[PDB]
Structure formats: structure tokens, C-alpha cells
Amino acid sequence: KDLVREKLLTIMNTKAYTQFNPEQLLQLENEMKIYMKSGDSALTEGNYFFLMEMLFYVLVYRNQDVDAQVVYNTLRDRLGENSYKMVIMKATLLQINGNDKGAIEYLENLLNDDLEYETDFVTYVSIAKKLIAIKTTSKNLSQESVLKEVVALTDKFPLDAELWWYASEIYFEMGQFEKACYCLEQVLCITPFNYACFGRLSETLYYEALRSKKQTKTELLEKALKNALRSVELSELYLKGWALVNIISRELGRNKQNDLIKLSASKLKEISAKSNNKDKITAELILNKI
Amino acid sequence: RLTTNWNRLINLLKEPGRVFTKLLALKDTTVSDLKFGFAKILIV
Amino acid sequence: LLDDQLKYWVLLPISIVMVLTGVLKQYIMTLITGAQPRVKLTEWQYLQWAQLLIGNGGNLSSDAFAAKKEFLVKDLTNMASFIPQTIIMWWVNHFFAGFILMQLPFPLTAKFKEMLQTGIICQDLDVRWVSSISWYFISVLGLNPVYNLIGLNDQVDKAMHAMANDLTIIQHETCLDNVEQRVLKQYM
Amino acid sequence: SFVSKLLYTVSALVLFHSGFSSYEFHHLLKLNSLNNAQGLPKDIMYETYAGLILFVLAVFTSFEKLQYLPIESNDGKIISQGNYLKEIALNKATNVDNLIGSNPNGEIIFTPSFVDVHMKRKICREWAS
Amino acid sequence: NATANVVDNKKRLLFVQDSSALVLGLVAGFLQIESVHGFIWFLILYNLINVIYIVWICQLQPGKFYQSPLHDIFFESFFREITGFVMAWTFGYAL
Amino acid sequence: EWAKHLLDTKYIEKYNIQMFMYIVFQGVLMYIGYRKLNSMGLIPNAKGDWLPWERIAHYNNGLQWFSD
Ligand SMILES: [C][C][C][C][C][C][C][C]C(=O)O[C]([C]OC(=O)[C][C][C][C][C][C][C])[C]OP([O])(=O)O[C][C]N([C])([C])[C]
Numbered sequence A: 001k002d003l004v005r006e007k008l009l010t011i012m013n014t015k016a017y018t019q020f021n022p023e024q025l026l027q028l029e030n031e032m033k034i035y036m037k038s039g040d041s042a043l044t045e046g047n048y049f050f051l052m053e054m055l056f057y058v059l060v061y062r063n064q065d066v067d068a069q070v071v072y073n074t075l076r077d078r079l080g081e082n083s084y085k086m087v088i089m090k091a092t093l094l095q096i097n098g099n100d101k102g103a104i105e106y107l108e109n110l111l112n113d114d115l116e117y118e119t120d121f122v123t124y125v126s127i128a129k130k131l132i133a134i135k136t137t138s139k140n141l142s143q144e145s146v147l148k149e150v151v152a153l154t155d156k157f158p159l160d161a162e163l164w165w166y167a168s169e170i171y172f173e174m175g176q177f178e179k180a181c182y183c184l185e186q187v188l189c190i191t192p193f194n195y196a197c198f199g200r201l202s203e204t205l206y207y208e209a210l211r212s213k214k215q216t217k218t219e220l221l222e223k224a225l226k227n228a229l230r231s232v233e234l235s236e237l238y239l240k241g242w243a244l245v246n247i248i249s250r251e252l253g254r255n256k257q258n259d260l261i262k263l264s265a266s267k268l269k270e271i272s273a274k275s276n277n278k279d280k281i282t283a284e285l286i287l288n289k290i
Numbered sequence B: 001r002l003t004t005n006w007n008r009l010i011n012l013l014k015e016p017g018r019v020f021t022k023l024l025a026l027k028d029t030t031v032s033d034l035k036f037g038f039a040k041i042l043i044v
Numbered sequence C: 001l002l003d004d005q006l007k008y009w010v011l012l013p014i015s016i017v018m019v020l021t022g023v024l025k026q027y028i029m030t031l032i033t034g035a036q037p038r039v040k041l042t043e044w045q046y047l048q049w050a051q052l053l054i055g056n057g058g059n060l061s062s063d064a065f066a067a068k069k070e071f072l073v074k075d076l077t078n079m080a081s082f083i084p085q086t087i088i089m090w091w092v093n094h095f096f097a098g099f100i101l102m103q104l105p106f107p108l109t110a111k112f113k114e115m116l117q118t119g120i121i122c123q124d125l126d127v128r129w130v131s132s133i134s135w136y137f138i139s140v141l142g143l144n145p146v147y148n149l150i151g152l153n154d155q156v157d158k159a160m161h162a163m164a165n166d167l168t169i170i171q172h173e174t175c176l177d178n179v180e181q182r183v184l185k186q187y188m
Numbered sequence D: 001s002f003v004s005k006l007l008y009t010v011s012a013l014v015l016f017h018s019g020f021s022s023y024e025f026h027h028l029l030k031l032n033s034l035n036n037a038q039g040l041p042k043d044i045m046y047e048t049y050a051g052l053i054l055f056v057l058a059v060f061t062s063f064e065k066l067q068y069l070p071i072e073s074n075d076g077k078i079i080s081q082g083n084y085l086k087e088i089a090l091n092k093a094t095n096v097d098n099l100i101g102s103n104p105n106g107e108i109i110f111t112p113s114f115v116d117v118h119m120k121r122k123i124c125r126e127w128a129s
Numbered sequence E: 001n002a003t004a005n006v007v008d009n010k011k012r013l014l015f016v017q018d019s020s021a022l023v024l025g026l027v028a029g030f031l032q033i034e035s036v037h038g039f040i041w042f043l044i045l046y047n048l049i050n051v052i053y054i055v056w057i058c059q060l061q062p063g064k065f066y067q068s069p070l071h072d073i074f075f076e077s078f079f080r081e082i083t084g085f086v087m088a089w090t091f092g093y094a095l
Numbered sequence F: 001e002w003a004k005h006l007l008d009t010k011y012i013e014k015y016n017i018q019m020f021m022y023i024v025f026q027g028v029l030m031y032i033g034y035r036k037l038n039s040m041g042l043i044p045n046a047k048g049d050w051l052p053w054e055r056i057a058h059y060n061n062g063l064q065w066f067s068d
Helices: A003-014 A022-038 A045-061 A066-075 A084-098 A103-113 A121-138 A144-154 A161-173 A179-190 A197-209 A214-234 A239-252 A255-271 A280-289 B002-011 B017-023 B029-035 C008-032 C038-055 C065-076 C079-095 C110-116 C133-142 C144-150 C156-166 C179-185 D003-027 D031-035 D041-060 D090-099 D112-122 E006-019 E026-030 E035-056 E069-075 E082-093 F002-009 F020-038
Strands: none
Touching: A003 A022, A003 A045, A022 A045, A045 A066, A045 A084, A045 D112, A066 A084, A084 A103, A084 A121, A103 A121, A121 A144, A121 D112, A144 A161, A161 A179, A161 A197, A179 A197, A179 C038, A197 A214, A197 A239, A197 F002, A214 A239, A214 C179, A214 D090, A239 A255, A239 A280, A239 F002, A255 A280, A255 C179, A280 F002, B002 D003, C008 C079, C008 C133, C008 C144, C038 C065, C038 C156, C065 C156, C079 C133, C110 C133, C133 C144, C133 E082, C144 E006, C144 E082, D003 D041, D003 E026, D041 E006, D041 E026, D041 E035, E006 E035, E006 E069, E026 E035, E026 E082, E035 E069, E035 E082
């Protein structure tokens, strides 16, 4: 049944398994192998090994990891241990197999051997991201991780959206709400048709408005409408854009905002129609609560 | 038509010899001469 | 005329050879395929960032248009055709010469009798009766659907600084201002 | 074997049979003309067009309506658009994305490496470990 | 406005059209069709197959799956499909 | 996405700062090929191309003329 292949490849290219709960992650791990060994037709070799390394990461997340060593042994055969995926995989393997930090130094000089472009730039970009992930745990927690990213970011690799997105997340978590607008604007700049960076760039403006003055509140809510209308224009059943437009227009409640309220209520009742699954429960509550 | 064609195929199915039957290269020249009109009787 | 069972040994090998040499051509073009300092790729990357902020990111940055430009300016300042067709013409003219292979279903003009019937030295045979080379002259044009079906697939700083100075007020795009009209222009 | 491959095999057999029968009939219209010193259309035609129509319906019944599985949930809940092709307007494309609980931007949104290290350090503590 | 999903359905259309220009022509060569009747036969049946494709697979809405559908289903890849028909017709006429 | 909905619907106040020319030109590019290369010998309106569609005139029509 190739629909399982569709689900697995969507999880793959979205990397949604990172955001999985342990129960659904266990379900993913259990239902992976049956198709992995049963439905072996029409599946290319590259997808075969991509599924293998997804299973490697799922096992490493999971409690038991002897199968992680087994899977790494099976996948070592092609392209050895010089590919960036393999380097990251074995670094994680040595980090978790004994809870020893040593891998970082055997990675560190490796980054200092990649300056001569022996591999692609995405390779040691990914290695830099992983070593920052290592070092934020080596010194358990600090704001300096953002500084590390910035010094790794600004000179070396502006283009990468992921770094700016993590900077914006850290700024939004407890930091300033203003620099996050700049970071999200850049993420919008690199990826033109991102329809979830407009929802975040409207939510951050809404959060910045709730502690502002009345004229600044009006300006920020106007900008939130002008940024949420693009999440409306780039997707129809996008839940968060419609909910945010409805919420801010309800907060204002003007006549043409009342027109937008009627339209957004109709669209949120369309979303909460039972075609969509488990997004009805977060739309209907916001609809019928107030 | 289906029965006669399928029975003709079945009878010749056996007698590798299959590849040489597919080859159609391997011969008696009398049928070749009779097909082209080469064979004739000259009445003198 | 009455041709005699030379359709097989001419039509089938020629088509097989064209299909196989097309596959080999695809594989060889795949295998053949037809900066080292970090600073070099870094500058190329910044150049590309300038290009995309000209074209890609210079559309929906309505508030942020003014802030970017200071940072930008401060940081900145046919063998494939020729080989196989000739080889196939050579092979066809070697192995298959002085034959009549078939008659086409459509009547050509007499210069095609000159071109196509090179094997035969007659003078009034027809235009519709062709030698073996004609089967190649069609098989070149018409083999695209078969290939599809079997499965086959296909100094620096000054200039961009000048365009950076050019793009300051060239176009501030009317986006994030008119979007309410366009949302209310649809979804009715 | 569902209808498409069945119709391919049946079309191939019918077309080969009709081709051989036409080969036989058109060979003994010149040989028989020569035997006289230079002196089965309807059923064959109808069989040939039957084979052609079978092939066309075999090429058209190879399209199945798109049906999915949700990324989040674990029951079947086939999310069917009732379409044969994929929409070109970005609104409906991202719509069919959003009905599934995934986000095509993916890595940029989740930032997989950092939350990966944090959660795999977290996963040791929780109860399922 | 539009996404990069047009390539997939365009490829599906191209496969359908390619597979419907090498059974036409072959059928014509089996029936020993002559010069001009063959071309008229091909035009009629090819446009009929395009119309039934618009009806059946496309759900009577050529827009929302292609842009400028009258240009893309009918006129595009037309001189890349008369020639495959000629090849198959020549192959069929010689047997 | 229930979490962000919950955190956005309620109130929180916490922070820590610390055109015809193209047609005519393409017609010229379509007509150069006809004039220059297909018109060498490969086009009808020559008298040597309608020869295979001409009649015989049926000379005798009433006579036999046997001989030795
Ligand atoms: C390269 C693809 C092959 C195309 C060949 C043309 C095939 C169509 C065709 O047979 O028309 C022929 C080609 O007679 C000629 O040879 C004159 C050519 C006229 C078209 C010239 C285009 C500029 C001319 O029409 P017709 O009525 O005067 O001939 C008698 C009727 N017929 C026996 C043909 C049924």
C-alpha cells in the first residue's frame, strides 16, 4: 500500500518526526519496518537509504539503540563516513552511545578541514549547525548560543533560513519582540512563498502591540492585518492565518473589519468542517468561545 | 479464426529449437524457386 | 514489385540499434555530465543575496525596504548531434545497400526519389519505393515517443555595487498595502 | 490485477491476433492474384477497432483518484479531494497540503537539528524510557 | 500565483498523448490506409482522444490544472506527435 | 496547533529585555526557411511534379493492328 510511502516521504521532507510525541513516534517506528520490508516495490534506492537513516534517527530518539548501531553498519557501505549526513549520524552515535562529549573535537578540526571546500558548502553549514547543537548542551544553557549563531551566521552564511528562524524563536521566547520582525522578514526574503512565516510575522506584531501605546497599537494591528492577509492570499484552509485575522478584526470591530469578521467566520467554519482532522478542535473553540 | 490460429500455435509450440523457429533463417530451394516463378516448363 | 521477407532483418535491427544507442547516449551524458576558500563562496553567496533581494525579496519588504540598503552597500562597499548520427549513417550505408525495403504510404516528390533510392540505378521505378536509408530518415524524427515511453529523462564588486546604488528608489512595491482589496476581490 | 493491466494484456493479445490475421489475408491477396496470372475485411476491421478502443480505455483507467493518510493521526480517515490531477493555483495546492497536518516549509519551521538535540536529551527522562 | 505542480499533470498529459500516437498509425498500417485518408483519420481520432481526455481525466475544467488549456492540450506537442504517428504508420504498412 | 491558539487567545504581558511586430518577425523567420532551403528542389508547382497524374490520350480506340 503506497499511501504509507506518501506519509513517510511527507514526514521525511518535512522532518515532522522531530516534533513527534513519544507515543506517535513509537507508532511511527513500529509501522515503518513492516512497509520497509514488505512494500519494497516502486521505491528507489535513494529513498531506501533515506528511510534507513530516518529509522536510525528514530531509534536514536527511542529508548533502545543497539539497532541504531546495526542500521548504521548497514548504511555505512555506500559513501562511507565522509558524507555530511554520515558525519552527523556518527557524531550523534558517539554522543549517545556513551554520553561522552568527545565527538565534538573530532568534529571541530573537521570543520577546520572543510574550509578548503573539499565538500559542498551545505555540508559544513550542517556541521556548524550540529556543533552549535552540541555546544549548547556542553554548556547547558545560555543566551550566548544566539551570539554563537550570529558569529557563525553573519560572516559565513546569511542565506540559510533555519538559523534566522531559530534566532527569531529565541528572541520571541523571552527576548525582544522587535528583532524577531527583522529575522522573520529575512526568512520571508529567502523563501518568497512561505505561508507560515507570515503567520509568525503577524503573531509577533500582535504580541508587540498588546504592550504598546494606543497609536502604536493601532499601527501594529494594522500591520498585523496587512501581513495576515498574505497568509490568506497564499492558502485557503490555513488555520492560523484565518484565526489571527478573525481575532484582530474582532478586537477592532470596525465596519469593514466587520465584513472581514463575517468572511473569516465563514472560512473558519469551513476549516472546522470535518474534512480537516484535529484542526477543527482549535478552530471551533476560538469560534464559539467569543 | 481464434481456434484454428491457437491450435496451429499449440501444435508447433514444441521443438533451443524455439529460437531457431523464431529465426526463420534456416532450407529447400524448390519452394523458393516455385514462389518467385523461377520454375517453369518450356514446351518446344 | 514483390519483396521477399527482408522486412525483418532490416526494420528490426535498425530500430533496436537506434533505441540502444539512444539509451547509451543518455547514460554516457549522465556519467560525463556534458571557490576553494570559504571567502570565495561567501562572496558568491552575498552576490546571490543581492540578486534575490533585487528580484525575490524586493516585493513584500514594504517597511524593511529602507533599512536593508545601508547594510547592503556597507558590506559590499554539436558533438552530441554529430557523433551518433554520422556513425549510424555510416553503418546503414555499409550493411544495407542496393536494396528496396518497402513503399511509403504517402507520395513524395521526385527529389526524394533522388535522395532515398541511392541503392538502385533505375530511372522510372517510383518515388514511393525507398531504400533502407529512408527508414532511418523517419526513425530519427519519430523516436521521441518511444524514448519517453520506455522511460528516460533530461571587477565583480563594482558592478553589483552600481546596481545596489541603482535599486535604492527604483521600485518600492505596492504590497502589504493593497492586500485587503485583493483578498476582498476573491473568496466571495 | 486491476482493470488497467488487464486491459493492457487483453489489448496486446487482441491487436497481435488482428495483425496476424491481416498479415495472412493481405499476403494471399497478392499470392492468390499471382496464382491466377494477375487476376475477411469487415470482421477484421471491427476486431482491430475493438483492440484500439480497449487500449485507449486501458490508458485512461490507469488514473486513480488521489487519496491520502493523515500525517498526525493513526486511523485511516482517507482525505480524498475527488480529483485526478493536481491544482496549479497555489491556493488549492497549499489547501491540499493543509488538510494533511503537515507544513511544506518543513525544516525552516521546525529547525530540526536544535530541537533534535534538545528532545533526544529530553527523551531519556520521560516515562516511556 | 501558480506553483510548480503544473509539471506533473503536464507530464501525465504527455504520457497519454505519446501512448495514443503509436497505436494509432499502427492500426492504420494494419488496415492499409492510404496517403490522405490516413492523415484525416489521424487528425479526427487524435482530437477525439484529446476531447475525451478533457472530459474524463480532467473533470470538465481544463483551467485549474493547466494555464491556457486550449494552447497546451491541442496545439502544444502536435508536430512532435504527427511524426510518431508517421513512424508507426510506416512500420505498420510494411507488414 | 492548539498551544499557540491558547497562548494567543488569552492575555499575556510578560517580557524580559535582558505586439504584431512579433507575429510579422516570426513570419519572416518561418518564410526564410521556405525560401532558402525547401525551395531548392523539394516543393511542387514544377511541371515535373504533376507528371504522375496525367493521362494517356487513348490513341487508337477502335483498332487492333496485329502483325508478325
Ligand atoms: C513530409 C510528409 C509527407 C507529406 C506528403 C503529402 C501527403 C498528402 C498527399 O498525398 O497529397 C498529395 C501529395 O502530392 C505531392 O507530393 C505534392 C505535395 C503537396 C504539399 C506541399 C506542401 C508545401 C497531393 O494531393 P493530390 O490530391 O493532388 O494527390 C492525389 C490524391 N492522393 C493520391 C494523394 C490521395
